[model samples]
Target: GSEGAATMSKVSFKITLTSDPRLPYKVLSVPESTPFTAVLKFAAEEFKVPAATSAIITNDGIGINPAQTAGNVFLKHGSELRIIPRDRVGSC
Candidate 1:
């Protein structure tokens, strides 16, 4: 931001939206020791989910909320964080 150019603030991962009845999920690469809340918050902003009801999950169904508190999810480069959008109820 020092030069008025938009610097890349985050590392991104490939995401796919689908039509299946299963949860809308994305496995994204994140930095090491990044909290699950931050990962979920980023995904929520990227995918444009409403603030009321969206969750970040891991492959094993672990979810973390951004507003409550930040905690370690053991993220690393090439690691995957699953963004689970609300069930057609809170998607923006």
Candidate 2:
């Protein structure tokens, strides 16, 4: 019953991974409370890289903070995101 309830609480998003529209995208189904870093981790795993070395950004080019939740960061279904190297940005 708890598994069913957890499944019900999850949401799906059709988000693009790269800037080029022609590139394949991902259908992310995660809990509303999932953190931004978790999403980046998924992308990093797919690309065979360490998640700590990458960052997630929105279509508007705003970086997503790992400390923030998907709901807190305003990520919604159909939102687009891009994974970039964290080293590209200066240390916080």
Candidate 3:
């Protein structure tokens, strides 16, 4: 008898995020095991911010920790996150 292997699905969650106190919210979807800091580059592109590594998420005045997993931190799907884009404009 030939047995077939089932394909594995990677589960991910969605988060609605925005810059603090302004800018409309947008989406960022990724796996739960991903680091909290991992969203910076994606968030930078999502919000059109010049500073990717400098971008970070905050909820209830609490910052998402760096070098941490989303699931371990109890992050939920459809979570609301705020981005503090620490950026500086330069002359071209």
Candidate 4:
């Protein structure tokens, strides 16, 4: 008898990140099962920002914890998001 291997289906959803209205809105679809930090990393790469120096926030100004899974954070499909960057530090 031949047995089939099981596969997990990836869930996709759209999320937008916008800082200024003058800049074009960027939307991306990611797996719901991925860690929230993964999304931050993706955004960091796309926008050429340092993921370690940025914080993810919802459109409502709620800070998103990087430790949570995307699906666990109540990230609704087609919802938009935001990113807040901290000040760059220099060695004295």
Which candidate number maximizes lDDT?
A: 2
Clashing pairs in 4: none
Best by TM-score: 2
After superposition on all C-alphas, the RMSD of every candidate to the true structure, in Å, is 7.0, 5.0, 7.9, 7.1
How many steric clashes between backbone atoms does each model show?
0, 0, 0, 0
lDDT of 1 at 64: 42
Model 3, residue 31: distance off in Å is 1.1
Q: Give the per-residue lDDT digits (tens) of candidate 3, residues 1-92.
A: 12324334222333444545555665555555666566666666666666543555556655565555655443542255556645357533
Candidate 4 runs further than 4 Å off: 1-21, 74-78, 87-92
Q: Give the TM-score of candidate 4.
A: 0.61
Error of 3 at 92 (Å): 20
Rank by lDDT, highest first: 2, 4, 3, 1
- Extract clashing residue pairs from model 2: none
lDDT tens digits, residue span 4-65, model 2: 34554565544454534675577666676777567667766765668786777777666766
The global C-alpha lDDT for each of the candidates, from Candidate 1 onward, is 0.48, 0.61, 0.52, 0.59
> In model 3, what lDDT does residue 92 have?
38
Question: Candidate 1, clashing residue pairs?
Answer: none
lDDT of 4 by residue, 5-89 (tens): 3335333334444555765445555555677667777767777777787766776666766555576654442245667774468
Residue 8, candidate 2: C-alpha displacement in angstroms? 2.3
